[PDB]
């Protein structure tokens, strides 16, 4: 009950909680590189071999 005064005082300095204001108002990207690699391997190969 002691800590409680402080928790309410902080919230008020924020105003509400923004936390809930936002939803009301509104190499992890790396593509599988296997598909691109397949194309690469094959074009190089064709030329290499028949060179």
């Amino acid at each position: 009950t002691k800590k409680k005064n402080e928790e309410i005082n902080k919230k008020s300095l924020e105003e509400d909680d923004e936390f809930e204001d936002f939803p009301i108002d509104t190499d992890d990207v790396e593509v599988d590189d296997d598909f691109t690699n397949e194309l690469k391997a094959e074009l190089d190969r064709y030329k290499r071999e028949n060179q």
Binding site: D34, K40, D44, R48
Partner: protein, 209 residues
């Protein structure tokens, strides 16, 4: 299965290689599946000697031959990694994707990380033995064009496993060599840094009482 199912392979390899010694099919996916899966995990986890032995000098895998196409592809990969035959590495990499990774329920989700992770391990390996290489040399060995290699290398380098640069105008590939007392120094401070932070966090807490 619980481990395989998630991304972490470290744990799986350790239980699933052991199931080679003893398998029971009771309410469990047949032994042939376990042979294939043990091999995939195998590659990702153990270092040179040990891993090689575990995924090759195993009597069981040799006795079982290549009876289905999927177990073939993965074993072919294993051969080429170990044998340092880097021409056939890339064809073998593509086969394993189509026929091992996707039939698998478990590695469906993890196809993306796995196949990419293999291109990095293999490249590291070639570079380790060489002070310097040429782009034209390196390129040829794998069976990709010179341009292609460069692009795909530029992904691996800042992420850092290759430990390398390309002096482009000259076309040579240099491999930074801080493996020594310097290495051991750098690692040791970072680990020290990690202990230092924890002490503060805990210190500050008790101190309030």
């Amino acid at each position: 299965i619980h481990c395989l199912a998630v991304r972490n392979f470290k744990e799986a390899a350790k239980l699933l290689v052991d199931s080679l010694a003893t398998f029971t099919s009771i309410e469990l996916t047949s032994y042939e599946s376990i042979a294939t899966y043990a091999s995939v995990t195998g590659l990702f986890t153990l270092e040179r000697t040990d891993l090689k032995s575990k995924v090759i000098d195993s009597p069981e895998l040799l006795s079982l031959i290549s009876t289905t196409a999927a177990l073939q592809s993965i074993s072919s990969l294993t051969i080429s990694l170990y044998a340092s035959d880097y021409a056939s590495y890339f064809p073998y990499l593509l086969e394993t994707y189509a026929n091992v990774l996707i039939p698998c329920k478990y590695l469906n989700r993890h196809a993306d990380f796995f196949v990419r992770e293999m291109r990095r391990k293999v490249y590291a390996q070639l570079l380790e033995s060489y002070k310097t290489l040429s782009l034209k040399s390196m390129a040829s060995a794998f069976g990709v064009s010179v341009a292609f290699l460069d692009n795909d290398l530029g992904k691996f380098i800042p992420n850092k496993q290759l430990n390398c640069v390309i002096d482009r105008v000259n076309g040579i590939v240099e491999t930074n060599r801080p493996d020594n007392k310097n290495a051991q120094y750098h690692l040791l401070v970072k680990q020290g840094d990690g202990l230092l932070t924890k002490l503060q966090k805990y210190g500050a807490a008790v101190r309030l009482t």
